[PDB]
């Protein structure tokens, strides 16, 4: 496993987010919102370019919990993995694991910025960092942890420059999503 875990806090998005994230998708293109069988029955015949347009309009903000990802299902995941890593013993597989130092979620969104620079949205960068800062605490965005951790990496200078604010944000996400 290179630069990743089975315990990182985006590996299992939940029904509160995954159902919301497709509701957020159907608002972008002119698709009807009726039920589960109608938010798929437009998308089962969309062209493959305009549906990947609606990913870039949506993933450029809202951060890592609003990424698309795995969901707990009863035939594939009995439990979220923090408990389920202790619920699976007596299986033998060696582990060679490790991250890089360059693995930032700005760096994992380098190709996301390119289409945002193409049409041109300078507000899709300053809204991206705070939405990443919104995700910097818990999954429920508790202020008691978000104000606690924003002291420890010392990034309360989102005022004039993006020199120290853009670097120390990458410091903070990498030591909670990666390492």
């Amino acid at each position: 496993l290179m630069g990743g875990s089975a315990l990182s806090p985006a590996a299992v998005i939940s029904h509160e987010r995954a159902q919301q994230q497709a509701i957020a998708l159907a608002k972008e293109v002119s698709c009807p919102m009726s039920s589960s069988q109608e938010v798929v029955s437009c998308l089962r015949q969309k062209p493959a370019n305009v549906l990947n347009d609606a990913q870039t309009k949506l993933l450029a903000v809202s951060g890592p919990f609003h990424y698309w990802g795995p969901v707990i299902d009863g035939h594939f995941l009995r439990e979220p993995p923090a408990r389920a890593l202790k619920r699976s013993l007596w299986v033998e597989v060696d582990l060679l694991i490790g991250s890089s130092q360059d693995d930032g979620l700005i760096n994992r969104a380098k190709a996301v910025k390119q289409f945002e620079e193409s049409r041109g949205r300078t507000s899709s960068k300053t809204a991206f960092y705070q939405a990443l800062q919104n995700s910097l605490g818990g999954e429920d965005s508790d202020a008691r942890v978000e104000a606690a951790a924003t002291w420890y990496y010392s990034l309360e200078h989102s005022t004039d420059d993006y020199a120290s604010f853009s670097r120390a944000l990458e410091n903070a996400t990498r030591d909670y999503f990666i390492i």
Binding site: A143, A147, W151
Partner: protein, 49 residues
């Protein structure tokens, strides 16, 4: 010309100088700036909120 020239405590970033009473009497810069940002900036937001 008796010891090292003491610089005054400039109350600003890039300053806050002091004197360490050792054999050479050197000029350090910033005492416990990690820990006096802990009790003064972290907890001062935790106590009021």
């Amino acid at each position: 010309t008796f010891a090292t020239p003491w610089p005054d405590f400039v109350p600003r970033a890039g300053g806050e100088n002091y004197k360490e009473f050792s054999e050479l009497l050197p000029n350090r810069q910033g005492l416990k700036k990690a820990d006096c940002s802990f009790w003064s900036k972290y907890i001062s937001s935790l106590k009021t909120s």
